[PDB]
Amino acid sequence: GELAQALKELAKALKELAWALKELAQALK
Amino acid sequence: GELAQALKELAKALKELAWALKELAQALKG
Amino acid sequence: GELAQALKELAKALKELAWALKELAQALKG
Amino acid sequence: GELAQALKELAKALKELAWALKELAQALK
Amino acid sequence: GELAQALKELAKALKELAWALKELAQALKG
Amino acid sequence: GELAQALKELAKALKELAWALKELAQALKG
């Protein structure tokens, strides 16, 4: 219910955080 | 539940971490 | 309940980190 | 059982992470 | 359980984040 | 199980962030 929806919301953020990390990795070379 | 409520505040905080890192990334690229 | 308040707390921790990294980011772009 | 022990292990790390954050805050002033 | 196993790998990662931030803190203080 | 692999994944995310911040830290101390 309300928790399966909260869980994909965490899934989205987790992807978002990865993308930012690749951007910062890129920025450090 | 209140667990779900928790996961919701964590997803919100991850998102702001993600934004901050992109901000930091750009700060360094320029 | 066992776990909810531990994940809520990790959310505040990351939120603080995000603010921390915006300040760092600001310091570096000047 | 094994999960109540894992949970205080997360509790410890959470404290540890806070302490590092105050150190970095300190470092930025 | 496998949930507990998860919380264990998260506590381990928080600890290394904590170390990295202190490393970053010192990098800036000097 | 629902949640385990999401928290395991957040652990890898933070581990990567910690490595990211060690590199940043190294870049700044020279």
Residue type, C15: K
Residue C28, C-beta contacts closer than 8 angstroms, at least 6 positions apart = B24, B27, B28
- Using an 8 Å Cβ cutoff, are C11 and E10 in contact? no
Residue type, F13: A
Residue D6 burial (10 A CB sphere; 0-12, 13-18, 19+): buried
Which contiguous run of DSSP H or E holds residue E5? helix E2-29
Distance CA A1, CA A12 (A): 17
Residue D24 contacts by C-beta under 8 Å, 6 or more apart in sequence?
Answer: C20, C24, E21, E22, E24, E25, E28
Question: Taken in order E2, E7, E8, E12, is the CA torsion positive or negative?
Answer: positive
For residue A17, the chain B residue with the least C-alpha distance is B18
CA distance B2 to A27: 38
What does the DSSP assignment read for A1-29? -HHHHHHHHHHHHHHHHHHHHHHHHHHT-
B and C interact (at least 3 Cβ pairs within 8 A): yes
| Residue C9 parent element (H or E) | helix C4-28
- This entry's atomic model was obtained through X-ray
Model resolution, angstroms: 2.7
